[PDB]
Amino acid sequence: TGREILEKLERREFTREVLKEALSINDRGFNEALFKLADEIRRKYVGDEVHIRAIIEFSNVCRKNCLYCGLRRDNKNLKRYRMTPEEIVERARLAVQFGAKTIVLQSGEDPYXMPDVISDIVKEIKKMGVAVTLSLGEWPREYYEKWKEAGADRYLLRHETANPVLHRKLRPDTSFENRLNCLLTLKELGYETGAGSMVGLPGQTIDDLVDDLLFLKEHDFDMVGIGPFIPHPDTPLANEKKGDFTLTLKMVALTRILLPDSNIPATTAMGTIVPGGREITLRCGANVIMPNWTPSPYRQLYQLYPGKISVFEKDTASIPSVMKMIELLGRKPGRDWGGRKRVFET
Numbered sequence: 001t002g003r004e005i006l007e008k009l010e011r012r013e014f015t016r017e018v019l020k021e022a023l024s025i026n027d028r029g030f031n032e033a034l035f036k037l038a039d040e041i042r043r044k045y046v047g048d049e050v051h052i053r054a055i056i057e058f059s060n061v062c063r064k065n066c067l068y069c070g071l072r073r074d075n076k077n078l079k080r081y082r083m084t085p086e087e088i089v090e091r092a093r094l095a096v097q098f099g100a101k102t103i104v105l106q107s108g109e110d111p112y113x114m115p116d117v118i119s120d121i122v123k124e125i126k127k128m129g130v131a132v133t134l135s136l137g138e139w140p141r142e143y144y145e146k147w148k149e150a151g152a153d154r155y156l157l158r159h160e161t162a163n164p165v166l167h168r169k170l171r172p173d174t175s176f177e178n179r180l181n182c183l184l185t186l187k188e189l190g191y192e193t194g195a196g197s198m199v200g201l202p203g204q205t206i207d208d209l210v211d212d213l214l215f216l217k218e219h220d221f222d223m224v225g226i227g228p229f230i231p232h233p234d235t236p237l238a239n240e241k242k243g244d245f246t247l248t249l250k251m252v253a254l255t256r257i258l259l260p261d262s263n264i265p266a267t268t269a270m271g272t273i274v275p276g277g278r279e280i281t282l283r284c285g286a287n288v289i290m291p292n293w294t295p296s297p298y299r300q301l302y303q304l305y306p307g308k309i310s311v312f313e314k315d316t317a318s319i320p321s322v323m324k325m326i327e328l329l330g331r332k333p334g335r336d337w338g339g340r341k342r343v344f345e346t
């Protein structure tokens with residue numbers, strides 16, 4: 001019954017059958033209790049601080065062709081852009097002036113920058129006394145090594161799906177094995193490492209979602225980014241169903257229960273499929289928010305999926321808006337870089 005699943009989650013009996021049953025029960029009472037449990041674990045382990053990561057999406061050029069993504073190379077109905085190094089550095093400086101304590105640099109897999117222009121940008125931003133997170137895709141070990149020597153602190157590389165068959169179908173340039181090898185290299189090089197997955201991919205099953213949770217737990221990732229699949233009209237998956245908000249929220253809540261000391265964002269995709277979805281997610285296990293800091297006129301050209309919020313407002317609105325959010329939630333802004341603070345247990 002739901003009570004018995006909750007009890008097993010509370011005593012840390014994280015078996016495959018317990019996770020499947022949590023994801024399969026659709027009862028409102030059960031779901032609300034699950035969300036309350038995750039919220040309480042979050043508060044006890046990571047407290048009330050919500051860490052702000054300012055994201056600059058500096059290029060929408062990509063060499064890969066992932067079937068879900070609006071930036072895929074085969075999409076000709078997109079104006080491509082690249083920010084200059086100076087633009088990136090100065091836009092980072094503006095975010096630090098606005099109180100950001102981590103800068104995230106994200107792009108398509110755009111060969112132009114790689115590896116040396118990224119290194120040069122990283123060194124300049126590190127002088128500002130903030131954490132730097134990279135989210136640039138799959139590259140050789142040597143590139144990751146260079147970026148770590150340049151001063152990068154963290155790397156986000158969602159595993160997308162832990163089903164190797166599904167992974168290869170959706171990401172035909174590469175494989176799950178390659179994705180995992182990148183994540184293991186990043187861990188070995190001393191990055192704080194983020195993984196995570198989409199929920200509601202075409203062909204993805206409940207057992208696949210269980211395998212995503214067990215994967216995350218196995219590798220003890222420092223950050224876990226989860227959101228729904230949202231179909232993009234200029235992709236092969238244009239006519240597929242969007243991922244379910246509630247199911248995706250349950251994946252966030254279980255991630256917190258499994259990895260109680262991790263850093264878990266309330267992703268912009270969650271706020272795209274449901275109005276107020278980030279705020280809900282911050283009350284169901286999440287403790288990080290990533291306001292968009294990409295400048296106009298580029299911001300509106302980086303749409304992995306459609307409907308992305310934060311496009312019509314001034315490009316400096318997002319940091320103040322998340323600071324208001326944090327206050328109205330009865331939470332506090334992060335006081336330091338918000339690195340992982342491990343609580344060793346049994």
Ligand SMILES: C[C@H](CCC(=O)NCCC[N+](C)(C)CCCS(=O)(=O)[O-])[C@H]1CC[C@H]2[C@@H]3[C@H](O)C[C@@H]4C[C@H](O)CC[C@]4(C)[C@H]3C[C@H](O)[C@]12C
Pocket residue numbers: 031032033035036037039040280283284
């Ligand atoms: C805000 C709404 C509706 C509350 C409501 O409107 N309930 C009636 C009035 C109650 N009051 C005490 C204000 C007055 C009672 C006297 S009265 O005379 O009105 O009957 C309630 C109903 C269900 C609640 C969520 C669930 O828990 C799951 C989850 C637990 C986490 O931990 C925090 C996040 C989350 C999503 C919760 C948020 C919020 O909390 C919800 C939406």
Ligand SMILES: C[C@H](CCC(=O)NCCC[N+](C)(C)CCCS(=O)(=O)[O-])[C@H]1CC[C@H]2[C@@H]3[C@H](O)C[C@@H]4C[C@H](O)CC[C@]4(C)[C@H]3C[C@H](O)[C@]12C
Pocket residue numbers: 096097098099100319320323
């Ligand atoms: C950038 C400009 C010009 C001056 C400047 O270049 N200022 C650098 C500050 C650098 N820090 C953020 C590291 C200071 C931390 C001080 S603190 O005492 O908060 O630790 C300054 C002048 C007024 C400042 C805003 C207001 O204040 C209100 C508000 C406070 C929140 O809090 C952060 C967000 C917000 C919107 C502020 C953003 C930014 O900052 C503004 C625009």
Ligand SMILES: Nc1ncnc2c1ncn2[C@@H]1O[C@H](C[Se]C[C@H](N)C(=O)O)[C@@H](O)[C@H]1O
Pocket residue numbers: 068069070157158160197198225227228229230231232267268269270290304305
């Ligand atoms: N089509 C679509 N739907 C949702 N999520 C997508 C899609 N394409 C790519 N992605 C995901 O974005 C991450 C990068 Se971080 C995303 C932000 N946190 C956000 O929510 O906007 C990719 O790794 C992929 O999972």
Ligand code: MET
Pocket residue numbers: 071106107108109135136137138156157158304
């Ligand atoms: C824009 S998608 C996120 C960054 C990188 N292209 C990746 O797929 O991991």
Ligand code: SF4
Pocket residue numbers: 062063064065066069070071072073107108109137
């Ligand atoms: S998900 Fe990342 S690698 Fe794949 S097409 Fe989009 S931008 Fe390129």
Ligand SMILES: [Cl-]
Pocket residue numbers: 053102104133154
């Ligand atoms: Cl980060």
Ligand SMILES: [Cl-]
Pocket residue numbers: 156224225226265267
């Ligand atoms: Cl993320």
